[PDB]
């Protein structure tokens, strides 16, 4: 057992409003989630992209070479 | 070289029990039905269904009744050890045109008309694919020869089809008036054939859209219960005494 | 409290038992 | 009115009971507005609109 | 009505391969195959047994081949998708007299010969079953009228068997050279049988011999192994205040 | 809950011991032993089978002589 | 038994190795000495004793 | 200088073992 020392305050959960916080800051969390993780969302899509569209071409001039 | 193999792809067309709120066209089941009966059953087996799935769907007890006793089944042994034939109730199953698969081969060419009970869920793009190639057959592309007894389709992967094209105008006569047209007959007979592939999609899409709805309202009570037991844990305000 | 409870949760095992099985043509 | 609602909430015996018949009434009234919605959006294609139902020869 | 209903009781025969280190008589189990296809199989069936299953019991591999080239066994379909006829091979069951169970009792004035593929694991003490009844046909005992068409056989369940007697003398002729009697026949065809009933048994009497002295090797050991262990608890002295 | 006890308890090794020849050891009075604590238990567990069994191979037998002519 | 302790049942592995030769040789001097019972006490109902063996017509 | 041995003499056991639950002597 860890010996902690600290004061914690608590409201009644029927004394607050539950869902309007959904909606709060909004511009904030928007701006928070696209900040922190763009580079994470850009090493995630641009491989599986770029290959996928690279497949595509590649399978085009393949199939217009074999042509007459 | 490999564009043939793959074979030429099937457009969308916009089907009547496509939607997530879209039944059958019973009308169209019924006629489909018909152009079965007069065209594809020759040769083709449709092993899964039965007389009595028809009732309630394209035809009335009666209707079923009378129409299964027209044909006839083996049946049997009698009390002497004998086989004997009997006309059809509407338990029986509908009647297969060849005794078993080397005798359909040898009928057609030594292909074999694949049974068509599946067949819509049995194929990519099944209902537009089947729509596609039954009123498909067209002259091959310059350069493409087709060996004898063979159809060209660009549907049919490869191309060369063993199937004559047999949808051709007026080759039914449907009891409702409307003309038997090469694509009114494709159309209909797609709908029944997408009916007996999958005959519990209005009872089970029915389900889904009651339960999905109830789910949801069950989701927003869901994230209310969870938000309401830990605003306690977080609007709580704590107080220590470290700083860095 | 012993009575009164009794009877209440004999209400709702009853309505649990028409709404679990839902006989509605059996009141003959 | 105050008489069952001063029993829901202060027995949970009715609050159970308000349970199964809230789950059984408002499952129906779901199941009979899908079924009315489908009906509207579907007409002319149900087995009883079939013009020749009936004559088969 | 009483004694009747139940039948008669059959002896204790002392069957060559009873005892914990008795094996089946391999003549006579080919002797009474040569009882079954010449007076049985006609109306008997034996569907378990495959000509495969005699090779190193009483036939040779040449001999169970040429024994299944003699019948005549229905196969296909051919490519033209027809049902033809080849000879037997060994992989393929003996042959049934009858198409099925109504064929044969139209046959047999309704009465149904049963497979004896299994009949001595298929009967009380079935042994001696099968031999008491084929050999004890005789008269029925005085004011007891048997049904014409059926035949008295008191070890027959209510005594009226539709089976005639088929065990006459010289009914076969045997090719090692044994008089063939009534009480010969029945021996050998019951030896056959009860082959048929268990082929493993030969294997599972040597099994059970020698597990079981070996199990019970083990069993002195478990028993030294345990009182080994138990020694220090059971030999102890234990000194306690207490009297009474 | 542990219990307290006081007690001198001596043991030798299991390899300075006979480990099988107890078991034949005053076989006769482990016979009689058996027999003389369990006598009643025994007569209370077969008299009843073989009583109820006798008697009804006497019923079988008596009504299987009473119906032949 | 003390020799024999000295060789085998000082190290583990070997008196394993014992016990799974003795697995192993054990039993398969019970199966020839069980099949050779049944071969004294079954004499002439062999399969191989069948006289007219080979000589179907 | 015995781990090497307790190896050596676990290895002889391990195939003596599979020797014994497959026999393959009409392999060898
Ligand atoms: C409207 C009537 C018919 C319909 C809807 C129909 C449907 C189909 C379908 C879905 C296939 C499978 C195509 C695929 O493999 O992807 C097929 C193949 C075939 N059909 Fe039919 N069929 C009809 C009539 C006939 C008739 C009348 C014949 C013969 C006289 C026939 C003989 C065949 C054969 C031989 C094949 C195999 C073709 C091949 O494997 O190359 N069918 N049919
Ligand atoms: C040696 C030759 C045969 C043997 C060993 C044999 C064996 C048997 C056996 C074990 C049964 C069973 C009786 C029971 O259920 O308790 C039976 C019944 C019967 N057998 Fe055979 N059988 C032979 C030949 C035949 C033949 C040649 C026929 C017809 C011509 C025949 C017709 C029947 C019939 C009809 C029954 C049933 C009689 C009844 O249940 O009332 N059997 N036989």
């Given at each position: 057992?860890?010996?902690?020392?600290?004061?914690?305050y608590?409201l009644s959960?029927?004394?607050?409003?539950?869902?309007?916080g959904?909606?709060?800051?909004?511009?904030?969390?928007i701006?928070?989630?696209?900040?922190?993780?763009?580079?994470?969302?850009?090493?995630?899509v641009?491989?599986v992209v770029?290959?996928?569209?690279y497949?595509?071409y590649?399978?085009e001039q393949?199939k217009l070479?074999?042509?007459? | 070289?490999?564009?043939?193999?793959?074979?030429?792809?099937?457009?969308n067309?916009?089907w009547?029990?496509?939607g997530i709120?879209?039944?059958?066209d019973?009308?169209?089941?019924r006629?489909?039905h018909?152009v079965?009966?007069?065209?594809?059953?020759?040769?083709?087996?449709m092993?899964?269904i039965?007389?009595?799935d028809?009732?309630?769907?394209?035809?009335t007890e009666?209707?079923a009744?009378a129409?299964?006793?027209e044909?006839?089944?083996?049946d049997?042994?009698n009390?002497?050890?004998?086989?004997?034939?009997?006309?059809?109730?509407?338990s029986?199953?509908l009647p297969?045109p060849?005794?078993?698969?080397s005798a359909?081969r040898?009928?057609n060419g030594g292909?074999?008309?694949?049974?068509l009970?599946l067949?819509?869920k049995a194929?990519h793009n099944?209902?537009?694919?089947?729509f596609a190639?039954?009123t498909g057959?067209?002259?091959?592309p310059?350069?493409?020869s087709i060996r004898e007894?063979?159809?060209?389709?660009?549907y049919?992967?490869?191309?060369?089809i063993?199937?004559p094209?047999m949808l051709?105008?007026?080759?039914?006569?449907?009891?409702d008036?409307?003309?038997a047209?090469?694509?009114?007959?494709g159309?209909?007979?797609?709908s029944?054939l997408?009916?007996?592939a999958e005959?519990?999609?209005?009872?089970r899409?029915?389900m889904?859209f009651?339960?999905?709805?109830?789910?949801?309202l069950?989701?927003?009570?869901?994230?209310?219960?969870?938000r309401?037991?830990?605003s306690?844990l977080?609007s709580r305000?704590l107080?220590?005494?470290?700083v860095? | 409290?012993?009575i009164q409870?009794?009877?209440?949760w004999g209400?709702?095992?009853?309505?649990?038992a028409?709404?679990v099985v839902?006989p509605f043509?059996?009141?003959? | 009115?105050?008489?069952?609602?001063?029993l829901?909430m202060?027995?949970?015996?009715?609050?159970?009971?308000?349970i199964?018949?809230?789950?059984?009434?408002?499952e129906?009234?779901?199941?009979?507005?899908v079924?009315?919605?489908?009906?509207?959006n579907?007409?002319?294609?149900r087995?009883e609109?079939?013009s020749?139902?009936?004559?088969?020869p």
């Amino acid at each position: 057992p860890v010996k902690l020392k600290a004061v914690v305050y608590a409201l009644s959960p029927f004394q607050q409003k539950i869902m309007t916080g959904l909606w709060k800051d909004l511009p904030e969390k928007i701006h928070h989630k696209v900040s922190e993780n763009w580079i994470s969302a850009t090493l995630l899509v641009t491989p599986v992209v770029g290959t996928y569209w690279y497949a595509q071409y590649f399978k085009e001039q393949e199939k217009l070479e074999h042509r007459f | 070289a490999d564009e043939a193999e793959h074979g030429l792809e099937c457009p969308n067309y916009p089907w009547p029990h496509e939607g997530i709120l879209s039944s059958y066209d019973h009308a169209s089941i019924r006629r489909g039905h018909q152009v079965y009966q007069q065209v594809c059953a020759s040769c083709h087996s449709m092993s899964l269904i039965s007389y009595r799935d028809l009732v309630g769907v394209a035809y009335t007890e009666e209707e079923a009744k009378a129409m299964a006793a027209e044909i006839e089944v083996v049946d049997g042994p009698n009390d002497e050890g004998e086989m004997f034939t009997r006309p059809g109730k509407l338990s029986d199953r509908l009647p297969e045109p060849y005794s078993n698969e080397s005798a359909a081969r040898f009928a057609n060419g030594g292909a074999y008309p694949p049974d068509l009970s599946l067949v819509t869920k049995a194929r990519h793009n099944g209902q537009n694919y089947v729509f596609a190639l039954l009123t498909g057959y067209r002259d091959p592309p310059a350069g493409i020869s087709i060996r004898e007894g063979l159809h060209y389709n660009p549907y049919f992967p490869g191309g060369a089809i063993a199937m004559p094209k047999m949808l051709n105008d007026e080759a039914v006569e449907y009891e409702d008036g409307t003309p038997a047209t090469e694509a009114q007959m494709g159309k209909d007979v797609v709908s029944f054939l997408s009916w007996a592939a999958e005959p519990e999609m209005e009872e089970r899409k029915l389900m889904g859209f009651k339960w999905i709805f109830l789910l949801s309202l069950a989701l927003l009570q869901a994230a209310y219960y969870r938000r309401l037991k830990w605003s306690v844990l977080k609007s709580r305000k704590l107080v220590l005494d470290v700083v860095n | 409290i012993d009575i009164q409870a009794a009877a209440g949760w004999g209400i709702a095992a009853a309505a649990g038992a028409i709404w679990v099985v839902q006989p509605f043509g059996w009141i003959k | 009115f105050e008489g069952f609602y001063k029993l829901i909430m202060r027995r949970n015996s009715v609050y159970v009971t308000f349970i199964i018949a809230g789950a059984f009434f408002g499952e129906r009234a779901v199941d009979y507005g899908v079924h009315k919605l489908w009906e509207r959006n579907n007409v002319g294609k149900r087995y009883e609109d079939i013009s020749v139902l009936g004559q088969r020869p």
